[PDB]
Amino acid sequence: AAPASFAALERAAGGRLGVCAIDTATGRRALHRADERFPFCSTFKAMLGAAVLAQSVAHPGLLQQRVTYGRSDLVNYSPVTERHVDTGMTVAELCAATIQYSDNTAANELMKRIGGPAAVTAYARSIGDDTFRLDRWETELNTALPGDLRDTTTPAAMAANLRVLVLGDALPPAQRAQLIEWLRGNKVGDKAIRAGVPTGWRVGDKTGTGDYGTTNDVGVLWPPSRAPIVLAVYYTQTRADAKAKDDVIAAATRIASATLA
């Protein structure tokens, strides 16, 4: 009954689905529109966290630096930063808030510190990603307009980034461990990739949502007795009034897992 392929799922759900899944042992892939651009929405916060950690290699005091912001700096959906207007937060605390809870002000404050959307894009280029482009700030970067190139990447490009960042040597070991810790601690993605993997699998991931019913999730999956799988899922719909489909990512995850079994 449930669609059994990425193409069948895309037909059943409507809209446009993009998947890149990599079995890091065999190199086998599960792919659908893997080289098409999608609005990445909050999945970029994985790259933002990596960019902050990379700057912390030359400036090891960066994570400790205290950032003070005001009421008028708050943007929509700031569940952690709205509690610390008076005290400020450290750069590390902002990274944790933006990756684990997808806190939006936290992302904007981190970007102010490190050089804005251009700095995240430059970091992407530095790890071999010529595709990723971050152009705007929260929450405008989630407008997800059909055809718009702003704030997009491809499933394949993001999957390649996750592979080198989590399982490769793009970051030194301490920063690599920190990025993995933050991704494993996603608290707001229970219905996405995490709902579509078999029990016993461990997940580190970053979700995203936006306008045009956009729902994304990217991460690394550790099965109990097998090499990890890198998985990037992007999904967006045709109408501005579209509602998020909170089950499409989990369905795509089941299909990717079956293909790579």
Residue with tokens 């990217």: 218
Q: Which of 42, 78, 102, 257 is catalytic?
A: 42
- What letter does residue 8 receive in the DSSP assignment? H
DSSP labels, 117-186: HHHHHHHHHHTT-SS-B----TTGGG---TT--TTEE-HHHHHHHHIIIIISSSS-HHHHHHHHHHHHT-
- Are 190 and 54 in contact by the 8 Å Cβ rule? The answer is no
How big is the CA angle at 41 (ends 38 and 43), to the nearest 5 degrees?
Answer: 95
Burial grade of 220 (CB within 10 A; 0-12, 13-18, 19 or more)? buried
Q: What are phi and psi of 216, to 5 degrees?
A: -130, 160
CA distance 16 to 8: 11
Active-site residue, 42 included: yes
- Tell me how crowded residue 249 is: count the other CB atoms within 10 A of its CB: 28
3-state secondary structure of 192: coil
Active site residues per annotation: 42
